[model samples]
Target chain A: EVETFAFQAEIAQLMSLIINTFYSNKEIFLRELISNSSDALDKIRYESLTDPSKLDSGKELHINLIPNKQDRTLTIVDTGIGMTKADLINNLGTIAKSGTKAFMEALQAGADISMIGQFGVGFYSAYLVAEKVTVITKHNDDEQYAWESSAGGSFTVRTDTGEPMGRGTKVILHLKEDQTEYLEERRIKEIVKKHSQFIGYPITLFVE
Target chain B: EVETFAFQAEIAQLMSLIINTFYSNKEIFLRELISNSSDALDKIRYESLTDPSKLDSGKELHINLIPNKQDRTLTIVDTGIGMTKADLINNLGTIAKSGTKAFMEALQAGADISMIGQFGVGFYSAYLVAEKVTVITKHNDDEQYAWESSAGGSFTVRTDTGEPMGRGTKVILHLKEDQTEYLEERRIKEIVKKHSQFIGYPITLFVE
Candidate 1:
């Protein structure tokens, strides 16, 4: 019988490794998120090479992070290739196309350190600090989708009232009690500075 | 153009994540490696239950760690499903299955701590302490192989030559200077208690 489309056994195991083990540095959650933003921009840039009109929206590829301490949440928004509700389910709900194996294979085959984001597990780095995450994405070509997940278990996919953007994705993380460190403007900005200072695209933080 | 099948572009970025930002606590390295050993033992035990006659004479499942201060090297040996050269190339050289992806997906699914160790990337924990690593393994199923890599980048695989174990795996790490704390018997023991204490196996360390 065809198993329901789920995290192919091993990818499911990586979550614990990411949360419980792989990352020891908590501050980088912002950095990872921003790097992801830069990558999204690059993805669009690469796609723009062939479809120059893709840039017709005239917005520079950039990232913005807004913190809501009252709700204990951090919103990281990017102007890259937004996701449709379908892209939301495909990108956030499952890791069926994760490049981890391919990256490792590349490492084994003499690939260098540049091969990481291809692994695609970077998106989940949000959980390293946040208890819950809600992704509001507006794809360049389709409707927006809201994807939400709590560290506790399970995630929800739903429609959002926000009109779909021409391109880009946004991630809102409800900081965990211990993860308030990321909610502070200075803290989040410092983290971005340390990790994404050299990001190909501009990254800004709107901290209260 | 499709580049070499070696390291992908994102892995290098992630390695920086791994080397610089991924892990906060270095002590988890032992727990992760020990977890893999436990997995190997479980595999053999399950196999023996149905085919007990396959074990080498007088051999039992065991994990041994040797620390060399002068050389800053630590060796971990395990007697679990040894791989053929091809197996090593397929398993070690390339990522085996989707252990990393699976772990992340499971974490997203809210899998608990008791359910960790389902992936193979745990061995890379050696990178937390070592500047270089050498994995020497002899499987009941194939010829011995040695896979070596340095933190500086690049790795080489060769057939192993030495007192061959009847069956199992071995990993040796040349710890960086700052990581010399790993040579302490007390430190190693403390790590075992904190993380691997409840593990249902024996892990021995030899230091001189």
Candidate 2:
């Protein structure tokens, strides 16, 4: 059974702004996603150094991009510090409603919105192109769990019985019809190189 | 220099509700305060077992109450796991705004509000009788810092120059004019016995 909860009113409003406001570089959404993945990987590595058992999920730290053209989905997978269900709700649900209002005012005053950028967790950039997003994560201290949101008024969190993983996170985005460009191998590689070629971790493509 | 930020809209609203809504047996605020302190002390003990350096601050753990009949203030000092500045903002600032609204609805529907009490950290119980509240904490990982709020639209977070401490937290509540009853030695002792005789930590009074 899925437990559903509403996004904070501000988070919903902020998501709409990110999706509708930036048409020039929807590609930066991938950049933000990769950046967040890097942080997660770094955190896990730091923690595992202090407690080696935290790396029981296997030590090969990397990011894997899986593009499923048949299903119009793209998944960014990382062997990194993942979230528990409470983490899922707290991390992904709330945004500063007051900050959103301030951002809207800045946009009206003709300020560059990019500088104002991703409000709470640049993770909202997932809404820039994906019609829906699902995150499956396994933390060293928690059971496998997941959450899904269509960037609507609500999101659902539940035990991810279908996913089998030792650790880390998998973020799957169901591409919008017009946003299918993200599903192409060449397009994604170009996006990665343009934004994250210098990231120290190995980012591998699923070719097999 | 004092730095101030407005409370989250929901947080301000919730604080207002809590300060106004709960009236009977306000001494129960001391109960909640000690419970929170007990939690802090328990956390520090657990962490120190893993990293013994967390105990360098002191070997003994206890809670002290300083009642200033002259100053009209009550202070609860706990030599427990304290908070960093970021912890101050995140811990003391945000509440589940939606939860507060739901709680308000429950109140309207004649639901037993006590069952839905203390919307966020239960620390809000301090506001039940304090005209102003101040928290000075020193975390093992960070410097001494404090935050102050008067259950108003904004609160201030700043580095402390006057306080000297190595670890733990000190919460000072300026009792409201009519709430001076809590400043009595006998009244406070009875309140502690009534609600928290079994907390396992020594609750001491300032008697010098």
Candidate 3:
């Protein structure tokens, strides 16, 4: 069953702020997503060491970057600890109500915006360049689910009938009209190497 | 009425592992706590800028470290968005189940343990040095509450009958036998400078 819910009032304001104010530096969206993917991959690899059976024993730990220029889309896939439906609502939906409002206020008041690490609002940065975002994830303890949002106050989650993802998440970004540069292989490889080469797992770019 | 609950089963094990294996370098506990304080202060300050009435506008956004060697205790105070009873349970009590279990397995397998930021378990690091920890916090929409835990599976949260913190939190750490070094002014300031001097807010060390 598919379920839809409106974003908290604060999250609506935050989305607009990120899109309008941070559009100039859209490249950061990739970096933030990649960083999050690395953290996810690290979690699964670490867990599998203790109880390999908790995850598919044969699945390798890595990140796959798939760019479809024809469709103007980019997908970041990871074999890591994925999300449950409840996690989608708690982690993706709510922006730590107080924390999000405060962070947006700081930016409005001319605080240094570069220090966003502490705010815990990194995931939404994807909306800076993406017109729409879809996440398909499967966790060991939960059924596969899909979450979709268009940088709006509302988002939808449904039981994903798509093929299983084994374990981890696939984040597909529908690039905005001017954000197609993200679909170029050379540009993406440069960004990945520049920002994520030190990441502990193998990050392979899938380019046709 | 006061409420109590056990840490998620996996969280209890993770806490025990961190305290037993990571106790040798207990100084990091102060750094982690201070880092969290700075983040808290940043949130409220940011929020208050837009809606001055959202928080106590009169209170300054800063961190205070008060060490009482006489009582073998250290208190970290912050004027930030304080946690409600619900936030206390969601943020402090439950671990991000997927992330927590994976992180512990990695450490047990001898992975480099210093990169703890991404794991979101830094708060429990306090148990590395404190035998018991108490949190007194107040939020604009919630009553002042006190939460205490002895690094055990269960923790207790109750209405605070004591003086109010106005807005934000005060974390009191009851230092352990050999961990009293953290109660020293000289040692603490050095750690603060090394790990958190660049934290945006003012961090005052109360020395008598």
Candidate 4:
């Protein structure tokens, strides 16, 4: 069953603004997602210290990328702490409620795109190249859930019975027709080395 | 009268770990502080939208570095959102209490020093090269306060009656005996150009 919700007033605008004007540094979206996956992995390890059972999944802690040229999509998968239905909605539904205004002003001032991560708008940066985004996550405490958005000012979340995720998240981005450079493996590796080389986890492409 | 409190157990250990093990890559402490200042500035700018008087000081938005070899201290100042008594206590006293455990694990794994930022341990990294840290801040909404620590398991905060500040923060680091390279104008500028050139604000050394 799928439930739909409208984006926060600020989230809708932020997505549109980032999608249209993100400019040449569009590749940094991968950097942001990688940072996020690392954070998620970091969180589960942190949790396991308090309750050792959190590591029951025992999946290798790493990140994987799958690119489908025909489908015009790139999927980023991570073996990290996943999100529950509530976590998915609350975390993905809104960027920083307060920092949103500051981000807009900073953007209009032609500030550097690096400013994006400072304001916690990292997840939304995926819109810079993806026309549609899907997040499939499985929390240890809950069943798998999928969150999808077209940046149409709304998003839909549903229990994912069709596919399985162990205990982590997969962010699937449907690339915009003109934004297909991300589907190339060489370009993907270049961006990773430049921006995410220090991440300390295996960030592998499906073919590579 | 100054108030003193011991750090959360994890905080004390994290500072010591970062301090003793943070080898040649200690220059990143500057990048993290600059980012904090920028964030503080961004926050005040954000608050000013709803309460314009927060900018009553009309100070230029920028970061200033003052390095004194004789005194063996480097001061970083920013015209941004200063903290109140509670903010000083809460913000500076303990970092990500949960992430501290994870940071220790990550550090033990010989992860890159850059991992500091991901865990919100940027401020604590100051201990890498600093024997002591002093924070003097003025908030438009609150009285001026100063927080000082030697990483001796505790810190002190008091009403700063010494100097005048408009509305911002100044972080003074008493450099360790061997860490005086930070006092050189040439070195300070290099670190900025490398890590913070995209900051979109002036980051100037006192003399140069």
Model 1 DockQ (Cα-based): 0.02
lDDT of each: 0.63, 0.75, 0.75, 0.81
Q: Give the best candidate by TM-score.
A: 4
> Model 4 over residues A33-56: C-alpha lDDT tens digits?
998898788667656654778888
Q: Write the per-residue lDDT of candidate 3 for residues B1-208, one digit (tens) a residue.
A: 7788888877788777777774356677878888778666756665564577876434677889999998889999998888888768754522345457556665665544454434656677788788899999888888999999997788899999998678888999999888888888899899998776556567899985
In order of the candidates, what TM-score does chain B achieve?
Answer: 0.81, 0.90, 0.91, 0.93
DockQ of candidate 3 compared with the true complex:
0.07
List residue ranges in candidate 3 displaced over 4 A. Answer: A1-208, B57-59, B91-95, B108-110
Off by over 4 Å in 4: A91-94, B1-124, B132-208
Off by over 4 Å in 2: A1-208, B91-102, B105-118
TM-score of predicted model 3? 0.59
Residues A45-148 of candidate 2 have per-residue lDDT tens digits of 65665478888887987899999988889999999888876668764422345346555665675545453333334677788889999999998878898899
Q: Which run of 10 residues does model 2 chain B get worst, by summed lDDT? A: B112-121
> Candidate 3: lDDT of A15?
76
lDDT of 3 by residue, A28-56 (tens): 67777877787677556555645678677
lDDT of 2 at A163: 54
lDDT of 1 by residue, B1-208 (tens): 1111243333333233346654457777778777766656655654554466658622577788788888788787888766566545443532323334444455566643233333345566667777788878777667777877664434566777777777778888788788888888999889887766544445778868
Q: Select the stronger candidate by DockQ from 1 and 3.
A: 3
Which CAPRI tier for candidate 2? Answer: incorrect
Candidate 1 lDDT by residue in tens digits, A1-208: 1112344344454444456764456665676677667656655665565478877754687888898889998988888877655545454523323244544454566644333333445676677777778888776676666777664434567767676555688898888798787778788767776665545455777857
